[PDB]
Amino acid sequence: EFDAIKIALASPDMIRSWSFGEVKKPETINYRTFKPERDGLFCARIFGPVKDYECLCGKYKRLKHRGVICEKCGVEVTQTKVRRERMGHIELASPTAHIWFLKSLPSRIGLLLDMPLRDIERVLYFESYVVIEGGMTNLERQQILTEEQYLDALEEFGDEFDAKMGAEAIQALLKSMDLEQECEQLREELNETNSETKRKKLTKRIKLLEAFVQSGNKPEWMILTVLPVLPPDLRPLVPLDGGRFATSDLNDLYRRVINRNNRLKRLLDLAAPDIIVRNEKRMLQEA
Amino acid sequence: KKRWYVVQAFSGFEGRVATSLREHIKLHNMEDLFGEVMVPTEEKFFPGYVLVQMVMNDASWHLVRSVPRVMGFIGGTSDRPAPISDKEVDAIMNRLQQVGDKPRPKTLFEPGEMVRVNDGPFADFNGVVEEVDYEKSRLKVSVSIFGRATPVELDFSQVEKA
Amino acid sequence: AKQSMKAREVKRVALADKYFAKRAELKAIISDVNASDEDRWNAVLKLQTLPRDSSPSRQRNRCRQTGRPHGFLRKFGLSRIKVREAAMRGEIPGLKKASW
Amino acid sequence: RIRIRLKAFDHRLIDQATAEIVETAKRTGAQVRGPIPLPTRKERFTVLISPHVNKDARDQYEIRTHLRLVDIVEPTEKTVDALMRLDLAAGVDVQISLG
Amino acid sequence: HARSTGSYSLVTQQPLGGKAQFGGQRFGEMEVWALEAYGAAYTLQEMLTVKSDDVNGRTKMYKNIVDGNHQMEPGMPESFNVLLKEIRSLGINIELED
Amino acid sequence: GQKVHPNGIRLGIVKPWNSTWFANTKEFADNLDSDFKVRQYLTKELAKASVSRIVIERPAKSIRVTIHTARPGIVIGKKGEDVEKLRKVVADIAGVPAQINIAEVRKPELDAKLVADSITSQLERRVMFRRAMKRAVQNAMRLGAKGIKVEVSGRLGGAEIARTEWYREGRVPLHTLRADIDYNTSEAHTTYGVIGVKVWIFKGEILG
Ligand SMILES: [Zn+2]
């Protein structure tokens, strides 16, 4: 039936190909009746109909037209286990780097961008700035920048100068990181040195640099742009004996990410100042 | 000169944080070190942030963080926290002055476009305007409910805004 | 009809649409007895300037399927000939051969 | 009171609608006025049938728009809404009017 | 306690646990090791695909047992598809090749 | 031009209309052009698919099309894969939320429109017309039609002199209004010209 299981990174096109509809609203269910939310976490159109071969709201109560989707229902028409395989995707307003590739010991983004973990987190939690192809100035590419380092630079290099922060900046760095070029450099660096410690420090960096080129894994796939949501059936919402719903923990996590993402979209609509959207994107990153 | 700063409160207790902040000012009588306290509101941005006209001494910083149900300032660092701007205050002032120039009784009414009907029997509905006289103030807007939306006899009476 | 003629009809419809308001305004001015002669005079002169096809009366009702100028019907937008075909095939709702 | 104007081409269809609506009114509310049938509009059309020329060859079609007037004397809370969910058969333009 | 065929859990299609809930005994990990230690291969395959998890597999099994044909149509554990959805719900792209 | 169109004359009694929607004069013609456009589209699209009768019906600013086809599968393709593609283009054509339904035509040998097309296809690929007509008639009778008549006209076998021929079998009463007479037409665009095909299929009488 099938040979080997292949694991790789998830591209945003791959996550949009898994998906069946963008999960917008964080509203779980109605909670006073029995119906869900249109269109919230537990949607109808994005996933499927609760009942088998039934529009949850009202049409098709026999076995003839399995598939029709009226405007009054905004519902698919398939099996009860169809929602268990279907997954949704949350359009994260602000880019958020993965925690599994930022804190794995050693971090995947720590030995790839030649930057210490401490400095990586600082910029990631809106506490430090990072340069990206500045131009004709006296600054490196990996070197970071602080409030005082940026303020002075802002008044100095007001023209051709780029110094972002957070996952966005990190993403750019990874995106603009010629893998092949680094290989030769690293390989030449390992053959032009005798330092024991350096040799081991260079062989561990070039090993993860050539392995990324051997596969179809991109450097910009580390940062999460199109967060995927697990199927409702796999995060079940059943009530215990009584009249309340004992809700799972993942519904709390997804509902907070969606609440924060809606807040961040509204603040980028309203053009809030810098410190507000830095706290907003930082709360989304931590969420 | 007093510059602005952003305070984070427990979101939901924001008016009580503003009242307790004014009261802590008038307790510890640093009256010359505080100008205002803003929580703006639309018919509520910002969702959990309190704007304070202030100056920066470490005494006033400890005062604002000793106000209860206040997490802290939001800035570049916690040593010298950050004021916001001033060039975006001129454009925000013109937008705040146009908050009561209209958006009420536009001369006559506002039929013809999409609107939400909700009054007496024919309530909680909608439909676009296709017939409405301003000489007799009569609006026979379609009663869209079961597809066939024949504009029933009505007027700027049930005319909502949906 | 030729393709060109229909295209000619379309252009006319657009122009009528485009210049409907200004054309209407001018006429009211010209009509208004309580208006200055020089103002009226300008209005009529202004009216000439406007493109001729702008006038609604220039455009002819053609069959929506064949563009056939004669035998048109307003209710259906089709020349008598096509009207019958549709009628027989049943395309036209409620329409049927009448006898009284 | 709720004045309702049913209009359609097939008379059988319209009658089916009218009976249906009455039941909705009668169960929920009370004192349904009645299905009052207004005059039928017989919009006629004549057309030449020859492709080219015979002024005597003609068909004469028509469209019979039928009317029904239903009124509800007492709109109850239950009755009025009942229609909301209670749509009718297609191709029969209803037109409700309270007062 | 004894169970032929009772209720099944909701998130992973495996039988429930306990006695008050009419459940089945946990064929734990060390028992899987003890059946790898023999050469019993079909016993372990039905012990963790047919008898436990695969829903179409176990309805085919129940029809085949009440008709006298001792035979299993294997299929896939549904809880492995749950593992695919939980790993796939991260930024990770797990698949099944060929 | 002697005979009256059998379908039309029966629209009131036994045949239903195809387009079934109400409109006032204002929105009437536009609907018609709308309907014409969409039918044209579907036919162009569903040529290889055996489609018999497109029934348009638009309630509440929404057009519900109903396609009668012999083989829905080719119309539907992969589940909801082809139909969906149609729906959106229909909406673009109608300019309103569209809805396509696919009614399955049992016994395509009895549907007139289908038969005509089959004949037309047969002519297009240069078969002996007479041999074609027989098959239509025989098939129809075999399937159990009360009666059937078929007629073809023009440049038959590329003959210079156009003539018309027609085979009847069973009984095909046209004067009887209550007779269910599925009538329809096609045109074969042969190298030698157009060849029109009419076919009457008399399912039986309706008693009301
Ligand atoms: Zn439905």
UniProtKB/Swiss-Prot annotation, chain E:
Domain of life: Bacteria
Complex and partners: The RNAP catalytic core consists of 2 alpha, 1 beta, 1 beta' and 1 omega subunit. When a sigma factor is associated with the core the holoenzyme is formed, which can initiate transcription.
Function: DNA-dependent RNA polymerase catalyzes the transcription of DNA into RNA using the four ribonucleoside triphosphates as substrates.
Similarity annotation: Belongs to the RNA polymerase beta chain family.
Name the UniProt record assigns to this protein: DNA-directed RNA polymerase subunit beta
Lineage: Bacteria, Pseudomonadati, Pseudomonadota, Gammaproteobacteria, Enterobacterales
Swiss-Prot record, chain F:
Disulfide bridge positions per record: none
Record's keyword terms, sorted: Ribonucleoprotein, Ribosomal protein, RNA-binding, rRNA-binding
Gene3D superfamilies: 3.30.300.20, Ribosomal protein S3, C-terminal domain
Keyword Ribosomal protein tagged: yes
Leader sequence residues: none
One Pfam family linked to the record: KH_2
InterPro entries membership: KH_dom (IPR004087), KH_dom-like_a/b (IPR015946), KH_dom_type_2 (IPR004044), KH_sf_prok-type (IPR009019), Ribosomal_S3_C_sf (IPR036419), Ribosomal_uS3_bac-typ (IPR005704), Ribosomal_uS3_C (IPR001351), Ribosomal_uS3_CS (IPR018280)
Chain's role: Binds the lower part of the 30S subunit head. Binds mRNA in the 70S ribosome, positioning it for translation.
Family: Belongs to the universal ribosomal protein uS3 family.
Protein name (database record): Small ribosomal subunit protein uS3
Species of the source: Escherichia coli O45:K1 (strain S88 / ExPEC)
Gene: rpsC
